[PDB]
């Protein structure tokens, strides 16, 4: 479709639109008594041109799969996003004045309870990565005509996650992606480092493989023209703007970030702005080409039961890769992402079988999570991203924001605990249960053998929210029949007798250490009940207490994790006050060190001998 | 001091050194059965030239404050670091063969139990930020002649944290810093994105303000020359290398990252390499100019007691800034860092009073933490870094690695919980207690008024490990006398009577809600004991149980945090099994939303009315 070169009337209408957007941003934030009108005002021409000249979308159906995508990475400009959607006719204009109220959904930063919002972006520097996932999906998966536009602040460009996204987009040739940089000179508490050194922004963007265009960000004509030419690269529109543009005496000034105008001032400024508006008549949105495919929404089922033999040995990290590849044969919706760790996590098995649905994200965990979030938007794909669980700590803010975004992504973190052995603590995940349990939409799977791992992958695929699967480096025996039924929130008793003296709860390597401890103790005529949680969150509280009532009220938890936030604390929190119920914990008490897996389990007090000694001390207490 | 231009004999000795380093890296990793010899071999000439021509250091005193610093950012090249320190005469050569053993300190990645290691770097992309802190300290604080050298991998350069550090170094004119990029074409599981496109690396470095020099990374002469010229910019030595250099048939090949040579192969390769060595005679290290100043090690004490009046109102975020500024008058060792949030966290007060000791880190939380770690190395400074607690999640891997680095840094995170109100959940820290409690060297302060905040700052300054202070946005009454004694691990009973029916544990805003609940309940002739933990980690278990025994065994915890990993779980874990002891929790059950602070405390069930209802239900249970 050809560029429609605007006439003066259309340009004036875009100017009028921009000024209406300024007025609304001021009105809403003054009414609220909080917000960021000066951050809205620098972006007003950009927003007017994108929404009312460049982009193609259904104004009454913002989530429509054919629409261009817009990502407001500088999320504190939310009032101007709300204003554009009122201008487009989707929101009632009166509702804008209810910004930030508990009675409204026009919250302080954008969130997906709003139909026009796909991802939450209030933590700066994350929007471009989500936009990259949307664009990758558009070009390679949907193979559709929609474009993706992402508006960033200049201070925001200090976040390294932005530059990971920059690099991703040029690696993957995202010529359907446009980044708009609101170079308004100022951050929150000082000028942004580069201020109005436009040439340095351009050099940085070009060095990272983008086509970079410097524009006057307050010229609707320059913006129309720059937006109106597609490229064969991701394109950066580097817009020179003034913070607080159009607010006399505030434009280009410090001390105004995140400060609303007092009511007397708002009135005077609004009259000034209003005097610039030539017509009240609004521009209409233009709809998209409807070429996005149908996506099925059905449950995804493994093509057959697991085919692992009891007593065979496999690491759960390898079972993960096998299971993911298997599920990829059952649904084309499954995609896999990994951060240069595919030979360690075994996501390489998926890549071998389904290369078109594997996304190499390189050593860039923050961006990987954001790509996954973007790919999951509008239910276009079912992403599984993997790395070492330790390195998911690099992406905690992206994971946190993924829950605020109501995202359905699946994360598999390998190499948990000290049982990795010789690499040492940098590679050892000892805080990942704490981290993922604190994510409010999470389900935490901790499979203890290959069968449980395959079942966890299948369950995760069909579970909403942030699903985490904790996998382990060493090989462990298969203990479950292939036809064992597994469910979220259902634990398994893997050893029991009628005279059990303690219920021992372990998972992964510590489940297997608990089973070996049981063999040790049998020597001593002491029996223990052994329970495998399967999911750490939610925890099968009923089976845990039923078990504990069978074993004199005594529970012992043993985990390859630090004491805080893990299995022991989950169990304690679930059962505290239950009469005759006691909980004793074994976990890792400090930063570990290198050695063989068995040696470290011993050093840190979570192997078979430690468990046996804790059981004896309970019995003799 | 002039460059000493090496003769052919010196160049040959550097070549011989490089080849000795290759042999040792192979021997050690073959002996261990794990490790990364091909990642060592690409760096062997770089390491030989740095250690035996360019840098100045005391070989027998690696921690000496006058020494040049070396940071191995690509930490999996640890065997070659160990080999250089054996070559320099500090380590016994036999010990190299004990790599990765539980009987050795030559662990899989470098760690500060090694005298020659300042920061742990096994999580890629963090070393350059630590190096920036070291260089900033050298140039601006110590005002000393030492230089800082940081070796990075090429895959590693995909981490956004690297680019934050790149930008920091050019902002702050770190002309005493050199980054060496080991452009060996390959990452772990595939070629690095840019492969041997040296010109693109150069353009990226130059765009970020560095002086960039492309060299043959296997030419000792080119390396000597490039290292031998100081600049007025941070300098990037962009070294074209081959992975596995010198290992015939492995050099430049895929499928060899992190794979040791089998013993038969090692023998053949080592003989080949050894045949290239012209002399066994080793080069000696050259010592530094001794111009680093003396740093005192004494306790740091506030110059006076707090001067806050009971019943006055102040937010703990503002008390933090006031307290930090005050302590800065007592010791020149205190430095402050903030990520473009100084007007929100009130670290601006410190900046006003002590501008030379404030480091603006911009919107780059990962790098901020790494700068702090680097500044704290060798005890040169006592850093306090601040941002919103929510945004510390962006830096969790840096914090995790800071504990592995045995670092003494202080972190103050503001804007905790839903009590911030209108910005919404992107800004609300609801997982920070979970996160910081999981850091094994942490102390977690949660001050409930301005007096407690000042005492927490003072205590943190004098406490080893990762200290976290959780501050709050809204103003709250001062409840403590200025002369109240505070200690790590000591809680306070702030309300008690002889007929108390429940012990209510709150902190920050929920302490004040618990006190208002107590006033509500008094109406009903119900008294409650109210306990302020002060530190969440370590928790005053004794006072909590003594309190609970006075209140019919009943504890109620109330927190502006998610359920997992916070105060309620800490308390439960501490007291589970204690007879007649029950714990009931109130916390935030899901992602919040915008509204007034009081409205959100109500919506999420953690305000005075929620507490009063939970107390009544205990009593009537
Ligand atoms: C990852 C990260 N780090 C820091 C910040 C903080 N911050 C912003 C806000 O969080 C808004 O999103 C902040 O203004 C709060 O509302 C302040 O709360 P108070 O309680 O103090 O009122 S916005 C921002 C600066 C961004 O500058 P630019 O990128 O240049 O954008 P522009 O406004 O100039 O267009 C900072 C530092 C966040 N949010 N995320
Ligand atoms: C933040 C982050 N993300 C990923 C990685 C993984 N990784 C490395 C190692 O972690 C070593 O530090 C990895 O090799 C493990 O030892 C493998 O464990 P196994 O159990 O599978 O044996 S190293 C690395 C690739 C780095 O490439 P370059 O930067 O190019 O360096 P070079 O080797 O070519 O010189 C990756 C992805 C870590 N560690 N950190
Ligand atoms: Mg700005
Ligand atoms: Mg490499
Ligand atoms: Na899922
Ligand atoms: Na401290």
- Helix H, strand E, coil C: the string for A525-577 is CCEEEEEECCEEECCCHHHHHHHHHHCCCEEEEEEEEECCCCHHHHHHHHHCC
**Angle ∠(B521,B523,B528) on CA atoms, nearest 5:** 30
CA pair distance A564, A249, nearest whole angstrom: 52
How determined? X-ray
CA pair distance A171, A524, nearest whole angstrom: 62
- The verdict on a CB contact (< 8 Å) between A435 and B438 is yes
Cβ(A556)–Cβ(A502) under 8 Å? yes
Cβ(A14)–Cβ(A283) under 8 Å? yes
* DSSP sequence for B386-410: EEEGGGGGGGHHHHHHHHHTT--EE
CA B363 to chain CA centroid, Å, is 17
Quick one: which of A614, A129, A42 has its CA closest to A369? A129
User: For residue B527, what are the β-bridge partners?
Assistant: B500
Structural domains of chain A ordered from first start: 1-294 (3.40.50.970), 295-488 (3.40.50.970), 489-621 (3.40.50.920)
- The verdict on a CB contact (< 8 Å) between B562 and A438 is yes
Cβ(B19)–Cβ(B276) under 8 Å? yes
Torsional class of A388: left (φ above 0), alpha (ψ -120 to 50), beta (otherwise): beta
Label the pairing between strands B235-240 and B177-183.
parallel
Cβ(B368)–Cβ(B387) under 8 Å? yes
| Cβ-Cβ contacts under 8 Å for B338 (sequence gap 6 or more) | A189, B345, B347, B348, B351, B358, B359, B360, B361, B368, B385, B386, B387
Residue in A with minimal Cα distance to B406:
A591
What stretches of A376-448 adopt beta strand conformation (E)? 382-388, 409-414, 442-445
d(CA A255, ligand 3 centre) in Å:
12
CA pair distance A110, A377, nearest whole angstrom: 15
CA pair distance B425, A100, nearest whole angstrom: 12
CA pair distance B460, B440, nearest whole angstrom: 16
Instruction: Report the run of H or E that residue B162 belongs to, with start and end.
Output: helix B160-171
DSSP B273: H
User: For residue B334, what are the β-bridge partners?
Assistant: B382
Check if A251 has its Cβ closer than 6 Å to any atom of ligand 2. no
CA pair distance B81, B90, nearest whole angstrom: 12
Instruction: Report the run of H or E that residue B64 belongs to, with start and end.
Output: none
Instruction: Report the run of H or E that residue B613 belongs to, with start and end.
Output: helix B608-619
Quick one: which of A551, A571, A546, A553 has its CA closest to A561? A571
**Residue located via tokens 């941003």:** A25
Contacts of A125 in chain B (CB under 8 A): 363
CA pair distance B126, B147, nearest whole angstrom: 18
Burial class (CB in 10 A: 0-12, 13-18, 19+), A433: buried
Is A578 among the catalytic positions?
Answer: no
Residue in A with minimal Cα distance to B153:
A363
A381-392 b/e with 16+ CB inside 10 Å = b? bbbbbbbbbbbb
Check if B427 has its Cβ closer than 6 Å to any atom of ligand 1. yes
Cβ(A422)–Cβ(A474) under 8 Å? no
The pair phi, psi for residue B179, each rounded to 5°, is: -105, 130
Cβ(A368)–Cβ(A395) under 8 Å? yes
* DSSP sequence for B438-474: TSTTEEEE---SHHHHHHHHHHHHT--SEEEEE--SS
Quick one: which of B312, B294, B381 has its CA closest to B66? B294
Check if A185 has its Cβ closer than 6 Å to any atom of ligand 1. no
Instruction: Report the run of H or E that residue A215 belongs to, with start and end.
Output: strand A211-216
Q: Is A348 helix (H, G, I), strand (E, B) or coil?
A: helix
Kindly give the interhelix angle for B608-619 and B509-522, rounded to the nearest 10 degrees. 60
**Is B184 assigned a ligand-binding role in the annotation?**
yes
Cβ(B239)–Cβ(B46) under 8 Å? yes
Quick one: which of A427, A371, A155, A163 has its CA closest to B162? A163
Ligand 2 atom at minimum distance from A427 CA = 10
- Chosen from B34, B199, B362, B582 to mutate, greatest number of chain A CBs within 10 A: B362
| Cβ-Cβ contacts under 8 Å for A78 (sequence gap 6 or more) | A35, A72, A99, A106, A107, A108, A109, A110
CA pair distance B294, B272, nearest whole angstrom: 49
Resolution of the determined structure in angstroms stands at 1.0
Check if A367 has its Cβ closer than 6 Å to any atom of ligand 2. no
For ligand 1, pick from B317, B340, B432 the residue to mutate: most ligand atoms within 8 Å of CB: B340
The pair phi, psi for residue A502, each rounded to 5°, is: -150, 145
CA pair distance A235, B416, nearest whole angstrom: 38
User: For residue A412, what are the β-bridge partners?
Assistant: A386, A469
Label the pairing between strands B535-537 and B442-445.
antiparallel
Torsional class of A534: left (φ above 0), alpha (ψ -120 to 50), beta (otherwise): left
Structure tokens at A329: 């044969």
Instruction: Report the run of H or E that residue B383 belongs to, with start and end.
Output: strand B382-388
| Cβ-Cβ contacts under 8 Å for A302 (sequence gap 6 or more) | A323, A326, A327, A330, A454, A458
Instruction: Report the run of H or E that residue A584 belongs to, with start and end.
Output: strand A582-588
Structure tokens at B170: 């050019």
CA distance readout (Å), A78 to A40, A67, A287, B167: 8, 20, 23, 28
* DSSP sequence for A443-488: EEE---SHHHHHHHHHHHHT--SEEEEE--SSEEE--S-TT----T
User: For residue B412, what are the β-bridge partners?
Assistant: B386, B469
CA pair distance B430, B407, nearest whole angstrom: 25
CA pair distance A269, A505, nearest whole angstrom: 65
| Cβ-Cβ contacts under 8 Å for B525 (sequence gap 6 or more) | none
Label the pairing between strands A177-183 and A148-153.
parallel
What stretches of B157-251 adopt beta strand conformation (E)? 177-183, 211-216, 235-240
The pair phi, psi for residue A500, each rounded to 5°, is: -75, 140
d(CA B323, ligand 6 centre) in Å:
14
Helix-strand-coil percent breakdown of chain B, rounded to 5? Answer: 40, 15, 40
CA pair distance A279, B404, nearest whole angstrom: 63
Q: Binding site for Mg(2+), residues of A?
A: 154, 184, 186
d(CA B294, ligand 6 centre) in Å:
20
The pair phi, psi for residue B428, each rounded to 5°, is: -90, 120
**Residue located via tokens 């796909």:** A118
Query: First-to-last CA distance in chain B?
Result: 81
Cβ(A213)–Cβ(A226) under 8 Å? yes
Structure tokens at B512: 């004040």
Cβ(A169)–Cβ(A135) under 8 Å? yes
CA pair distance A599, A593, nearest whole angstrom: 10
- The verdict on a CB contact (< 8 Å) between A123 and B426 is yes
Which one is catalytic: B45, B159, B221, B365? B365
Which one is catalytic: A156, A164, A221, A365? A365
Cβ(B437)–Cβ(A563) under 8 Å? no
Q: HEC states along B88-157?
A: CCCCCHHHHHHCCCCCCCCCCCCCCCCCCCCCCCCCCCCHHHHHHHHHHHHHHHHCCCCCEEEEEECHHH
Instruction: Report the run of H or E that residue A611 belongs to, with start and end.
Output: helix A608-619
Structure tokens at B400: 């995790």
Cβ(B440)–Cβ(B464) under 8 Å? no
CA atoms within 13 A on the CB side of B576: 25
**Cα Rg, chain B, nearest whole Å:** 28
Structure tokens at B339: 């990520």
Torsional class of B572: left (φ above 0), alpha (ψ -120 to 50), beta (otherwise): alpha
- The verdict on a CB contact (< 8 Å) between B440 and A562 is yes
* DSSP sequence for A293-333: PP---S----SS---PPTT-EEEHHHHHHHHHHHHHHH-TT
Quick one: which of B593, B589, B605, B563 has its CA closest to B420? B593
CA distance readout (Å), B28 to B35, B79, B83: 8, 7, 9
- Which of B111, B161, B187 has its CB closest to that of A160? B161
CA pair distance B248, B245, nearest whole angstrom: 8
CA pair distance B102, B108, nearest whole angstrom: 11
Kindly give the interhelix angle for B127-136 and B365-376, rounded to the nearest 10 degrees. 60
What is the number of CB-based contacts under 8 A between chain A and chain B?
330
Cβ(A189)–Cβ(B348) under 8 Å? yes
CA pair distance B354, A581, nearest whole angstrom: 55
CA pair distance B437, B446, nearest whole angstrom: 12
Cβ(B433)–Cβ(B152) under 8 Å? no
CA A49 to chain CA centroid, Å, is 30
**Cα Rg, chain A, nearest whole Å:** 28
**Is B36 assigned a ligand-binding role in the annotation?**
yes
Cβ(B24)–Cβ(B83) under 8 Å? yes
DSSP A289: P
Helix-strand-coil percent breakdown of chain A, rounded to 5? Answer: 40, 15, 40
DSSP B109: S
| Cβ-Cβ contacts under 8 Å for B455 (sequence gap 6 or more) | B306, B447, B484, B486
DSSP B416: B
Neighbours of A300 (CB within 10 A): 17
d(CA B92, ligand 3 centre) in Å:
55
Cβ(B560)–Cβ(B416) under 8 Å? yes
CA pair distance A236, A215, nearest whole angstrom: 10
Kindly give the interhelix angle for B160-171 and B127-136, rounded to the nearest 10 degrees. 20
- The verdict on a CB contact (< 8 Å) between A158 and B363 is yes
Number of H helices, E strands in chain A: 21, 19
Quick one: which of B203, B120, B226, B210 has its CA closest to B173? B210
DSSP B335: E
d(CA A607, ligand 6 centre) in Å:
34
- The verdict on a CB contact (< 8 Å) between A108 and B423 is yes
Burial class (CB in 10 A: 0-12, 13-18, 19+), A281: exposed
CA distance readout (Å), A526 to A519, A522, B391, B569: 9, 5, 50, 31
């Amino acid at each position: 479709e050809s560029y429609h070169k605007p006439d003066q009337q259309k340009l004036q209408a875009l100017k009028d639109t921009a000024n209406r957007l300024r007025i609304s941003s001021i009105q809403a934030t003054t009414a609220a008594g909080s917000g960021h009108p000066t951050s809205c005002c620098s972006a007003a021409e950009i927003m007017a041109v994108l929404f009312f000249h460049t982009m193609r979308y259904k104004s009454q159906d913002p989530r429509n799969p054919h629409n261009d995508r817009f990502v407001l990475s500088k999320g504190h400009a939310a009032p101007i996003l709300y204003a554009v959607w009122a201008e487009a006719g989707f929101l009632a204009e009166a509702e804008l004045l209810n910004l930030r109220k508990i009675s409204s959904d026009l919250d302080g930063h954008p969130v997906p309870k709003q139909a026009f919002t796909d991802v939450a972006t209030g933590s700066l520097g994350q929007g471009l990565g989500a936009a990259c996932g949307m664009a990758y999906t558009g070009k390679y998966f949907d193979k559709a005509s929609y474009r993706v536009y992402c508006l960033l602040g200049d201070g925001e460009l200090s976040e390294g996650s932005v530059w990971e996204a920059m690099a991703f987009a040029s690696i993957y040739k995202l010529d359907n992606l446009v980044a708009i940089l609101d170079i308004n000179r100022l951050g929150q508490s000082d000028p942004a480092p580069l201020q109005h050194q436009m040439d340095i922004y351009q050099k940085r963007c070009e060095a990272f493989g983008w086509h970079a265009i410097i524009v006057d960000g307050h010229s609707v004509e320059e913006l129309c023209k720059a937006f109106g030419q597609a490229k064969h690269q991701p394109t950066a529109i580097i817009a020179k703007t003034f913070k607080g543009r159009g607010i006399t005496g505030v434009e280009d000034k410090e001390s105004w970030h995140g400060k609303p105008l007092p009511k007397n001032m708002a009135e005077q400024i609004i009259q000034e702005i209003y005097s610039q508006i030539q017509s009240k008549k609004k521009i209409l949105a233009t709809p998209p080409q409807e070429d996005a495919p149908s996506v099925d929404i059905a449950n995804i089922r493994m093509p057959s039961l697991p085919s692992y033999k009891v007593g065979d040995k496999i690491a759960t990290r390898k079972a993960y890769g096998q299971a993911l590849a298997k599920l990829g044969h059952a649904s084309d919706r499954i995609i896999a992402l990994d951060g240069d760790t595919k030979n360690s996590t075994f996501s390489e098995i998926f890549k071998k079988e389904h290369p078109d649905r594997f996304i190499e994200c390189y050593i860039a965990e923050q961006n990987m999570v954001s790509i996954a979030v973007g790919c999951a938007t509008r239910n276009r794909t079912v992403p599984f991203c993997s790395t070492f669980a330790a390195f998911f700590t690099r992406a905690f803010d992206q994971i946190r924001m993924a829950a605020i975004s109501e995202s359905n992504i699946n994360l598999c973190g390998s190499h948990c605990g000290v049982s990795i052995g010789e690499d040492g603590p940098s590679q050892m995940a000892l805080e990942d249960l704490a981290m993922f349990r604190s994510v409010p939409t999470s389900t935490v799977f901790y499979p203890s053998d290959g069968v449980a791992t395959e079942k966890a992958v299948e369950l995760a695929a069909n579970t909403k929210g942030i699903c985490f699967i904790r996998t382990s480096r060493p090989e462990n025996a298969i203990i479950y029949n292939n036809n064992e039924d597994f469910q979220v929130g259902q634990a398994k008793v893997v050893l029991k007798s009628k005279d059990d003296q303690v219920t021992v709860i372990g998972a992964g390597v510590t489940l297997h250490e608990a089973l070996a401890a049981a063999e040790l103790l049998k020597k001593e005529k002491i029996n223990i009940r052994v329970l495998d949680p399967f999911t750490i969150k939610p925890l099968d509280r009923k089976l845990i207490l039923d078990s504990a009532r069978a074993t004199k009220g005594r529970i012992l938890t043993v985990e390859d994790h630090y004491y805080e936030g893990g299995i022991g604390e989950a169990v304690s929190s679930a059962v505290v006050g239950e009469p005759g119920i006691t909980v004793t914990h074994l976990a890792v008490n400090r930063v570990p060190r290198s050695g063989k897996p068995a040696e470290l389990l011993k050093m840190f007090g979570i192997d078979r001998d430690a468990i046996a000694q804790a059981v004896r001390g309970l019995i003799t207490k």
